[PDB]
Amino acid sequence: PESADLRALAKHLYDSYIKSFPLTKAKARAILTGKTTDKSPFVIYDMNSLMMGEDKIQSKEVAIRIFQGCQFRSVEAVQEITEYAKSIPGFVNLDLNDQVTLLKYGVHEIIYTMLASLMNKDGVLISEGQGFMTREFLKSLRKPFGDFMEPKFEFAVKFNALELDDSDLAIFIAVIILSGDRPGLLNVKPIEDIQDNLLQALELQLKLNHPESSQLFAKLLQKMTDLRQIVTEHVQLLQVIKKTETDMSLHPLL
Numbered sequence: 001p002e003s004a005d006l007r008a009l010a011k012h013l014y015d016s017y018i019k020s021f022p023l024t025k026a027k028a029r030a031i032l033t034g035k036t037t038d039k040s041p042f043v044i045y046d047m048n049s050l051m052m053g054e055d056k057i058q059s060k061e062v063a064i065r066i067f068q069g070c071q072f073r074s075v076e077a078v079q080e081i082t083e084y085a086k087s088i089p090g091f092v093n094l095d096l097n098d099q100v101t102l103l104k105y106g107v108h109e110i111i112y113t114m115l116a117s118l119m120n121k122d123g124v125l126i127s128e129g130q131g132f133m134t135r136e137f138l139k140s141l142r143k144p145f146g147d148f149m150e151p152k153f154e155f156a157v158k159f160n161a162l163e164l165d166d167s168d169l170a171i172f173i174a175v176i177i178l179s180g181d182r183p184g185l186l187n188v189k190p191i192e193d194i195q196d197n198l199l200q201a202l203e204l205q206l207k208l209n210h211p212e213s214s215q216l217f218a219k220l221l222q223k224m225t226d227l228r229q230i231v232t233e234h235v236q237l238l239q240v241i242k243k244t245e246t247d248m249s250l251h252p253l254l
């Protein structure tokens with residue numbers, strides 16, 4: 001009886017989703033189907049394509065500049081995640097430090113999954129679908145730059161297999177956002193109750209959109225906890241960032 005209404009509420013967030021996320025998974029996999037009216041984006045196999053691809057988008061080296069690109073488009077994505085989380089009923093009624101804490105620990109995970117929406121078996125989409133780069137080239141970068149994005153693939157091959165459509169991610173990223181099992185938290189009640197309702201809606205949205213599917217919900221939550229593993233493992237990265245300041249390089253001619 002109650003669930004009948006929230007579906008609408010669920011779909012409400014769907015609207016804000018595309019209003020907050022300009023590129024949907026359906027359009028990513030679509031532009032990667034080849035059966036699309038739009039032009040096929042260009043691959044990035046070899047440095048030739050890099051030289052001719054920076055056009056279709058202080059820095060000096062580029063093996064760093066790519067990394068700076070990933071994190072830059074990340075700080076662009078968070079600006080979508082802010083307003084999205086705002087559009088969650090009750091979200092602004094929680095404590096400001098509690099909300100910034102919620103996004104504090106979830107951002108890398110949700111950009112992980114969205115990137116998985118732009119990912120595939122071998123490669124990823126760049127610049128709102130206008131580009132495509134390959135993992136094989138990614139393996140060949142100077143260490144540790146070669147190992148930065150591959151785990152992302154190691155998640156995309158597992159996640160995109162469930163082949164969720166945007167109507168599921170629109171609220172799944174909400175349930176990952178409103179997670180109550182984080183340290184340094186203040187108001188316990190609101191995240192518990194709202195995550196309960198969220199889990200109510202998500203349950204039978206999952207069960208409704210795919211009746212042939214067998215227990216995608218549960219194991220997918222298990223993959224949420226796997227995303228928690230990967231935030232446990234981002235501590236290394238945030239320190240490998242230390243390759244970009246005062247490094248005994250003199251530029252007399254450059």
Ligand SMILES: O=C(O)c1c(Sc2ccccc2)c2cc(Cl)ccc2n1Cc1ccc(Cl)cc1
Pocket residue numbers: 054057065066067068069070072073074077111114115118125126127128
């Ligand atoms: O300009 C971009 O949109 C982009 C960039 S930025 C860029 C990259 C190469 C030449 C010029 C800019 C980017 C960089 C990396 Cl190493 C990986 C993915 C990247 N992307 C695509 C991207 C799309 C979505 C998200 Cl969340 C993160 C990255």
